[PDB]
Amino acid sequence: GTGVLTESNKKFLPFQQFGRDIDDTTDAVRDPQTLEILDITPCSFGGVSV
Amino acid sequence: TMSLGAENSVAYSNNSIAIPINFTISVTTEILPVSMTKTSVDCTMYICGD
Ligand SMILES: *[C@@H]1O[C@H](CO)[C@@H](O[C@@H]2O[C@H](CO)[C@@H](O)[C@H](O)[C@H]2NC(C)=O)[C@H](O)[C@H]1NC(C)=O
C-alpha cells in the first residue's frame, strides 16, 4: 500500500494481522517484527484550482 | 382488503347551510430537501491508484 503510518489505540486479537473499514478499505496493520498496531491514513490529495 | 376511510353522507338539502361557530389556529410542519453532499471523485486514483 501507500499511506501515512501512525501509532494507534486499536486492540487486535492475538491471531489478527490487518484491520478493515466498513468499505473493505484496510485501515490498520500489525508490524510482524514488533507486534504494535499501526493506523494507515491516506497521503494527502485533492483538486488544484486557479 | 384495505379501507379508504370512514363513509359520510354529507347532510345536503337545497335550503340548509352549515356555518362554523368557532375555529382552531393550526400549526403544520413541512420538511423539504434542498441539497446533497458535494462529493467529487478522482477518476485516475479510483480506477488505478499509485
Ligand atoms: C523479532 O526480533 C526482535 C529483536 O530480538 C524481538 O524484539 C526484542 O528486541 C530486544 C532488543 O532490542 C530484546 O531485548 C527483546 O528480548 C526482544 N523481544 C521482546 C519480546 O521484546 C522481537 O520480539 C522478535 N519478534 C518475534 C515475533 O519473534
From Swiss-Prot, chain B:
The glycosylation sites annotated in the UniProt record are 14, 22
Q: What does this protein do?
A: Precursor of the fusion protein processed in the biosynthesis of the S protein and the formation of virus particle. Mediates fusion of the virion and cellular membranes by functioning as a class I viral fusion protein. Contains two viral fusion peptides that are unmasked after cleavage. The S2/S2' cleavage occurs during virus entry at the cell membrane by host TMPRSS2 or during endocytosis by host CSTL.
User: What protein name applies here?
Assistant: Spike protein S2
Tell me what organism the protein belongs to.
Answer: Severe acute respiratory syndrome coronavirus 2
Its lineage opens with: Viruses, Riboviria, Orthornavirae, Pisuviricota, Pisoniviricetes
